[PDB]
Symmetry: D2
Subunit: 333 residues, 4 copies
């Protein structure tokens, strides 16, 4: 495969490493995290409150992190410019620290000998891609790219199927979203976004999300036709998209289901899922889909105005898409 270095060994960094090592679709050869040393990396990778103990062996050997017998070079650079990616043989770097989302900042890795960078977040100026939706618009000239956000990877496949078949005239989305590392256990400082500092385990917290507008970038005909917002709620993982949209062509709810179900069995297999079961959020913990349409939870007001519900494991589904994107890029070289 392509040899991958991971910058930022957090929720996404470690679950991208889990998906890479377990799927075998790419090879992790290096990790950088100045806040997690090699022995700490062993513990943080082995144990996971949300996805359970890693099924396999992980150890420290001669200064390397050894996962299922295979060594991984470890870096401790706060400055992404000083990471010697080339010497470790890492061709692609996953930028998952949360603090290098612009091309200028994410371009640091190229200096170390990396050849392309995949920002595990929206970017102000890097080209953004959602597997199943616009990844074929990638081309080899793009050395710095973004895999958008979890919420965008949930909404864009759904919005693609609804728009392709019935036309979205306009839509508004809410995501009811699990807590993340940027939140606080008790009321604490968060100077730019005051509500995000309030106690994550106590509160429903409204928050902004660019995910709906960003869908207008991965689906250009939806530009200006979608926006939305978010609620953070006290669950540790798994989120859900609630898309209220008005349709061009009339659609009985059973045709929406039928069309969404066909897409989940066809080209969006593994990316867009479909279910009619009485599911709840924990039923999608460690599910690798980008988006699972929840037939029974949605509701139509009429044939042109509907509320559609789609679940996503915001940690693990997104991490698998990071791997899929990199594998697609490597196949295009």
């Amino acid at each position: 495969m392509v040899k991958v270095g991971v910058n930022g060994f957090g929720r996404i960094g470690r679950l991208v490493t889990r998906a890479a090592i377990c799927s075998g679709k790419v090879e992790i050869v290096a990790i950088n995290d100045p806040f997690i040393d090699l022995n700490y990396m062993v513990y943080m990778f082995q144990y996971d409150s949300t996805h359970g103990k890693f099924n396999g062996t992980v150890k420290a050997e001669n200064g390397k992190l050894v996962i299922n017998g295979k060594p991984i070079t470890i870096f401790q650079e706060r400055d992404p410019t000083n990471i010697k990616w080339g010497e470790a043989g890492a061709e692609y770097v996953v930028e998952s620290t949360g603090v290098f989302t612009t091309m200028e900042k994410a371009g640091a890795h190229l200096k170390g000998g990396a050849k392309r960078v995949i920002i595990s977040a929206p970017s102000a100026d890097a080209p953004m891609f959602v597997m199943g939706v616009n990844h074929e618009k990638y081309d080899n000239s793009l050395k710095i790219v973004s895999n958008a956000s979890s919420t965008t990877n949930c909404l864009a496949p759904l919005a693609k199927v609804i728009h392709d078949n019935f036309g979205i005239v306009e839509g508004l989305m809410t995501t009811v979203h699990a807590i993340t590392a940027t939140q606080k256990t008790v009321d604490g400082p968060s100077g730019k976004l005051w509500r995000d500092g309030r106690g994550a385990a106590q509160n429903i917290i409204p928050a902004s999300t660019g995910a709906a507008k960003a869908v207008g970038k991965v689906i250009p005909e939806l530009n200006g036709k979608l926006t939305g917002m978010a609620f953070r709620v006290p669950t540790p993982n798994v989120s859900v998209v609630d898309l209220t949209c008005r349709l061009e062509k009339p659609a009985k709810y059973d045709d929406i289901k039928k069309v969404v179900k066909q897409a989940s069995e066809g080209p969006l297999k593994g990316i867009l899922g479909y279910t009619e079961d009485q599911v709840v959020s924990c039923d999608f913990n460690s599910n690798s889909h980008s988006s699972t349409f929840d037939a029974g939870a949605g509701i139509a007001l009429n044939d042109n105005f509907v509320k559609l519900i789609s679940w996503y494991d915001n940690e693990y589904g997104y991490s698998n898409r990071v791997v899929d994107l990199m594998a697609y890029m490597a196949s295009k070289e």
Copy 2:
């Protein structure tokens, strides 16, 4: 003031009793609950995990419950027909067990001498009223009435203001709702509502709600123009309405804020609130409003298609509305 019996000393029964006692609009004179004996009522009224210790005295004396020096007759009847309301002097009865919501069942209280019954829940056939929206359409021939649901009591005053000023062509609603007594601590049997049995503290749980349709009964012009659904999430109190609606007349977001703020200061004062602060759900705990508009959390895609956010303490706001409705009804005797 009217004298009141409370049937069902649960979350709503006890909080109706709080709001009545320390606001002097009505007088609780009797309570029936066959699963809470007198001494247990002292303890359950005294302490509240959500709203804090009762501020006042509560004791058991001569077989009655005495709150701030005022004795309350205590019954232990599983069947409402056997409650001697009249002999206790309860003129109105708050039906807050959750299992007598039809006119046939709630009417059992009139056999014990009660004059009128206020069901603390939507009713399949009893007329439904929301303070500030349609309570003046009540008339004195109605011996059995419903105070709708807490979600209807949050959505309807907002919908009234929006529809009065701009016309709601159509709307879809989501309520992100706190846990209630009908849910389960761990995955367990829940009759035919299978999702409602799943662990309340672990899950985001989609659920059905009539509230948006019931708005079409409370605001006739909106009949068939609103529906919606709910997500139960792990908080113990306080919920929020997310109304996505299409407007007939174009409205800038700042014009929406203007009319809502003005309504909150005029005829809907104390029922509909308005805020521009960076609030989260806990900021409405023990808030007696039916609906507080949250200016900053909402978002407009354009001048005719907007997402509006309104907070509600589903426990204490509704319970004050139950008192207000009975005081209003009493004022028309």
Copy 3:
């Protein structure tokens, strides 16, 4: 392998069924639960908020619950005297409803053709057993037995090792315990035990437990030398034992560690575990041990006065021990 019937398809009944299947030690041939119809059992067995989706197939077919292709007979009787266990071939019945814990009540299963009953909880009069501690005291005259509680199955193996090497003069135990089905989502009625009705998601809740005393029954020499209590805290699963005990023979803390480590690799392997990792409760979710010693978490005041810490998955470890006890009983036949 012995054919087993399950009375009460709850947390324990369902995880005993998972454990039976995952381990092959017994064969579930029938299940009784009047509150969970056949199609509903498919769903409750398949989806699990705590332990994840069932790994295998489960379907309803021709009136039977079919798990991994094996059909299981389904009863729907509230009264155990009416379950036709013998018609289904069930020799042992797991009594896991929580309402038939005496020998009189559990004995109803013998009227239906069951040969033995294993009560999934402490019993007032049925003999109680803890795998690895006193299960060899079981003999074939015992047609009704108790597998004690999960807290006893955690405390007793540890207490046995400690007492056999240094002698426990006296000890007091706290278990910090996850929430269970008997608790309430919000402050509600709990007539017998007032604290157990307070909202489980909000509260540290003191609770009684006879578990440490029950160790005096399974380890006779410790009779009257152990008692304890519990705190119910807001987690969905996994609990921890905190044993403060005085020792007759002096022991350095690393003598304690080494003796427990040896026991966990010898005759108590699979029952008592040992770790020095910086674990937290979620690291034992879905762990089959009765009791895992946490070396780093305990602390000694001196060589004779120590506080020892041991983790237990209260759902899954206990369920595996029920299966283990039935399999041991079968080999004695």
Copy 4:
């Protein structure tokens, strides 16, 4: 009343301010925090997820934080030696950042013109005081003091009563402790305390505490006779001390209750509380006691070996003790 400056507007500094204003025992005249603008201070003081909205008026006016009409000078100094306490009239300074807990660091505030410094945390080298237990050991030569920790303030009053009357031969403590600002919302990096980084809302987490050893300095006769540890649990606030101790003189449990009750009504009034009710943790939210003994939750094994339970609001009880300690110091000047 003494005029007080507050360094750090985190939970402690804010709740100390609430306590000071609500009790009128001292006057806040100045606040320093370089990470929080004045308008953010208004918001953070006004809204509190745990203790509810401030009951009073909070606004910014001419660069000052005006609480109930009284203005308060605001500083934004990185370095405490640069804060100008003197010109603000601040005589005592609460050092509530957590990083200036030594006498050398805390003394910096003396360079700004403050007369005394009260560290709101344990100190390596400043004398630690527990109100009600050893505050008689304060003298006017002490310019820098510590109020110890909230757990120390729970345990020491209870230990004193029990050791004064029966003699603690040796004791082992566990505190079951609510979530704090040092924890993480999801599994994240946590320096050398690996367990503290695991998801706070999901886990029961073992932790260290110096509180038991500190009580052996607050009460010198107990030096080397107490040690302990903590479990971090998923609640927002309120903790509980679990003290298992051996008594020199034998005591019936009703003897223990009687002397504790007697101390709570006498010299430890308002510091040590006493209850026999079926309390749970939320019943002590915003309670100003250091320690409330829970008669029904404890258990005696015999007359020389007991487990004693005492509740503390780890946020608000401690904050009120900071104010009382300052008022006590001011009365000795």
